[PDB]
Amino acid sequence: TNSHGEKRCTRYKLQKTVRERGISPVSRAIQEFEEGQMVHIDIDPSVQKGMPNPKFQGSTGKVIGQRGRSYVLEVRSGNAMKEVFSLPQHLKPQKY
Amino acid sequence: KPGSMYRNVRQRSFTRRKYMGGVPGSQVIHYDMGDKANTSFPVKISLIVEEKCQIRHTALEAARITANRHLVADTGKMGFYMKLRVYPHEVIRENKSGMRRAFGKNVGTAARVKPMQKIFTVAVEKQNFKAAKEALWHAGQKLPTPCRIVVDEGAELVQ
Amino acid sequence: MRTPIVEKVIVHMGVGESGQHLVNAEDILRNITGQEVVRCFAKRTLPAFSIKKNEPIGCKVTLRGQKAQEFLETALGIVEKTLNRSQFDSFGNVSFGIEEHTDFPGMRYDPNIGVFGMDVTVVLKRPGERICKRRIAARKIPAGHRVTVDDAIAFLNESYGVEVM
Amino acid sequence: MATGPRYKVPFRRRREGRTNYHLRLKLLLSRQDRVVVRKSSRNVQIQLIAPTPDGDITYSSAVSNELAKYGYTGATGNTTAAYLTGLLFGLKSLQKGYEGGILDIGLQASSAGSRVYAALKGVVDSGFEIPCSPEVFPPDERIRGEHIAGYREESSDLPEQFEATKEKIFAEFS
RNA sequence: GAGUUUGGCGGCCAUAGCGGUAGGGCAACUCCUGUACCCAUCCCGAACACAGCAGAUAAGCCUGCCCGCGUUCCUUACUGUACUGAAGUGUGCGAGCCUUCGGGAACUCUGGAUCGCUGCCAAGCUCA
RNA sequence: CCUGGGGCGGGACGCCCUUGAAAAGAUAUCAAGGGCGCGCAAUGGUUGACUCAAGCGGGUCGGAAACUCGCUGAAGAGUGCAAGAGCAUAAGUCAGCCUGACGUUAUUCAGCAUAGCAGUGGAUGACGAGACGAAAGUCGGCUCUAGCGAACUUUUGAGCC
RNA sequence: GGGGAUCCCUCGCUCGCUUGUCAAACUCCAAACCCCCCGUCAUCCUAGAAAGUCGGAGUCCGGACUGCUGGGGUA
Ligand SMILES: [Mg+2]
Ligand SMILES: [Mg+2]
Ligand SMILES: [Mg+2]
């Protein structure tokens, strides 16, 4: 039977480009966001902790608040709203 | 089994050796024929395919044998250089219960082709061109697809 | 500023198996060299030579400077300071492995000890080696700065008269 | 070692071999300034650096060469020169507007009695807040004049010069 | 007040790497001289640490250059080719393929470029 | 009970990874490749010092089977166990010091796209105590995703009704 | 490494330069559809958008055509 764990079908989803593997840039981890500021979900495989479920890959949410070193996002899946915790290392601003 | 059982291309490829098991060997022994060390044949004709299909290795072996016999009989042992191109990488499986767990098991090997894709190639002199055409026409008779002959190099010489 | 000064000399002492031969190997090494040594372990278990994983097998020291000079002159006089090209290498690294040890000056004969083979090696380098080994800004030496065999023999003959065959 | 398209080349500051990015990532998580105490042979350098998406802006940058105005006519590579540099840096940064941060020694060994910890002593004694512990602070016996006693007994004009430079550092920045 | 040089901390992370070659050190960095002290070696003042005057640009670093490998970019052809979204009383015995409107490669080809760009601060200076 | 009628065979009857699956998400068959119902007081935590696989050149019968010195070496090694992913001043190797393999508690995510459903797990946190370290920080076991079970009943722990 | 006392010498497997084929569990590359968000147009909307609360159900034997070379199977 097929499994239904939390990392299924992520062979290429959670990979790094060949000229990207290793230590990722550190400035991406100290970026700071404010309220109501659209961001993009782009999971960085190099960081093991604070990773949202990879089904939210490539979605855009808005910041709602901060809990420690993690921002609270508001992502739409289908017709629902899902609140996703993610460290700022996996996030990326929207360029207007 | 009959030829038309495994000749159409309806399903995905199935060629990874390390996952399947027990593929039987092949019969075709040598893929280069005639004077390999020569490189000064001015005419280079070839047999091409008019439709996508699968060719069993046995058909390729029969075609190679017949072309070899004709070319050696007429042109000479040192007057040509035949070279087969397509190698059989596909695998053929035959179910053998009913439809209960109908997935088959390996029985042979086949080589897929594509339209206008060269299969054989013969190089000869100017005086043995007609013999080359005569040889390549019999070889295409054992082949499971319509086939036409194209003179690739030295077309102005022959034509 | 670009003369091929000797870097250091490592006095390896293999025994083929641990035990009393190993221990008195370090003993004679510290008598002959004037500083303690350190054992070397194995990498796996090879019963053919009768070894086992992570068992001590030999000895080693890394004397340098005036100790290196004195050992060089001593063992050069011992083996006539005449080196053929077999041990010799691309960077002037000699590796002459003499076996009998009592021929050293000051090694008193022992019926139990008798003989214990060793090997002597020298490493030649040009001035400037901080660059390849310092923790900060660790670069790599370029080819033109690297040492050569003929300059190695020239240095050996000029500083010690170390003839090379 | 680029031999093909799959080869991975390190960052520029890694090829230079003058940075450690894991340490940098651990340091930036403090949300607070950093004190950089990089040293050399002819002198020592201290400066306060904060991060930004473009580069690393710096607010204060004091160097041990600046003692020449005050009158520290001694060696610039000793521990006491590091203490003087740290002291004047601390006063300068306190008056400027900045007060605290984190100690960052980069790729250097953290051993007690070092010149980096001498600069740390000079910083802490000035009022510049910084988290640390006292056990690594070098004792003043080497701070004054006594780490060069055994080879330069003919030169023991240090302590009066140290006192004069300390009082002049206080005078200028107060 | 503008510029140059040097030094430190960095952003993009091979257009920056690999290899080759000719020049420079006055201020600065480095190499470089030893082991009283804090400090150190699974042995070694090698390294790290400390103390620093000598000599040197042979190395690190800096400037100029090289198409010789690797990477990035443009152009000629391959070619509007392969593939493809929508509609079709268009077509083949069949597995399939064709027409119109809209998108559009990869390799390879002729010829050129790429031997990094750039942010903050300090010091020596060089002007009015 | 499933089942290309039932039977026989087997378990596609619970959990985890790759493909099928048609470049968001979902997607069936007795579809293909398979694995798990555990092991470890160190094979765990932290700090410090280092670089691994494989070749080339040298040394004594240390034989094409040993250990050592120099060079090339972004990883071709190792990381307890499947498959896939991650990792180089390290998530690897060794040494020192330690037991966070801690008590209590709140949300959000998936199991169970969209769109109800236990128990139970995994990510952020909060209170109370610690380990290592100059500090920053890391530590809620063993780099990430498997190694497991409601109500009722008995037994055990602290204090109460 | 296999052929028949200086291993007399043959020499397959293997390593490099060139030629000819591959991949569903390969990828230095890489579309057209498609998905989240911002702006604009356009349509719906105070004769009530989005959201929320309560009442009543049926349904969980489906089938076919045009595409996906869909998977399996000789079909
Ligand atoms: Mg039944
Ligand atoms: Mg019903
Ligand atoms: Mg219809």
Numbering used by the authors:
A (entry chain BR): 2 to 97
B (entry chain BI): 4 to 99, 111 to 173
C (entry chain BF): 1 to 165
D (entry chain BN): 1 to 174
Sentences from the paper on this structure:
pmcRibosomes are essential macromolecular machines responsible for protein synthesis. Here, we report the cryo-electron microscopy (cryo-EM) structure of the ribosome from Methanosarcina acetivorans, a previously unreported high-resolution structure from a model mesophilic methanogenic archaeon. Compared to ribosomes from extremophiles, the M. acetivorans ribosome has a simplified architecture, lacking paralogous duplications and containing a reduced complement of ribosomal proteins. Methanosarcina acetivorans is a methanogenic mesophilic (∼35 °C), nonhalotolerant (0.4 M NaCl), neutrophile (pH∼7) and strictly anaerobic archaeon that has emerged as a model organism for its methane production and scavenging.
To investigate the rRNA modification of ribosomes isolated from methanol- and acetate-grown cells, particularly around the peptidyl transferase center (PTC), we increased nominal resolutions of the 50S subunit ribosomes by combining particles containing 50S subunit (either 50S subunit alone or 50S within the 70S form) and obtained resolutions at 2.38 Å from methanol-grown cells and at 2.85 Å resolution from acetate-grown cells. In both cryo-EM maps, local resolution around the PTC reached approximately 2.5 Å or higher, allowing us to identify coordinated metals without ambiguity including magnesium, potassium, and zinc. Our 50S subunits from methanol- and acetate-grown cells were similar in overall structure, rRNA secondary and tertiary structures and r-protein composition. Only a modest difference in RNA modification profiles were observed between the ribosomes isolated from methanol-grown and acetate-grown cells. Compared to those from acetate grown cells, 50S ribosomal subunits from methanol-grown cells do carry two additional modifications: G2260 has a 2′-O-methylation (Gm2260) and G2615 has an N7-methylation (m7G2615), which is positioned near the PTC. Two other modifications are found, at U2563 (2′-O-methylation, Um2563) and G2564 (2′-O-methylation, Gm2564) of ribosomes from cells grown with both substrates. In addition, the similarity of the combinatorial ROC AUCs for 50S between growth substrates further supports the overall similarity of the ribosome structure in these two conditions. Our comparative cryo-EM analysis of ribosomes isolated from methanol- and acetate-grown cells revealed nearly identical structures of rRNAs, consistent with our previous in vivo DMS probing study.
